[PDB]
Symmetry: C2
Subunit: 75 residues, 2 copies
DNA sequence: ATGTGACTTATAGTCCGTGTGATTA
DNA sequence: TAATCACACGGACTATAAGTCACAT
């Protein structure tokens, strides 16, 4: 159980949904399997930084904004 | 290899030194091996979020702090 | 559109070391 | 004498992430 990891996964889901995207959409765009993405959102996967960097590209977001957004999800 | 990995491994090493801690010290406070902290600093090495989370605790800074500094060091 | 258990390969991360170039004596 | 210190790097592990799937929702 990690505080940071479940914030990171909540932030990912949020953005994806804000932007009206599906997992299949985020998957194609980060070049990750869409069942991998589902595992990440359900907080059952401790992704690495390389993986996280592809997700960000996949959300069509900068690293700076994603982290800003993450510090905003941390409250 | 990865952009974000070099920045993350840079900021870790910076803060570490700004608190005059050793790699041995950081390893001990983070519950990682000293040889792994060496690798993270030298070769960037693909940490997980959990292990980043532990290195933030061992550095003794808030998650917010770390990320604010991470942002800055990407902005050239 | 998405959750999940199962699986194999790849690599994250551990634990024993040695060597070099600085100290402090 | 040394004698620690701080780090790079090794070799050989072990633990877990990566990456994928059929079948269900």
């Amino acid at each position: 159980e990690s505080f940071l990891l479940s914030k990171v996964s909540f932030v990912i889901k949020k953005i994806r949904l804000e932007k009206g995207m599906t997992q299949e959409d985020l998957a194609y765009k980060s070049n990750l399997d869409r069942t991998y993405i589902s595992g990440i959102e359900r907080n059952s996967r401790n992704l690495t930084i390389k993986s996280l960097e592809l997700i960000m590209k996949g959300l069509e977001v900068s690293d700076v904004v994603f982290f800003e957004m993450l510090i905003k999800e941390i409250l």
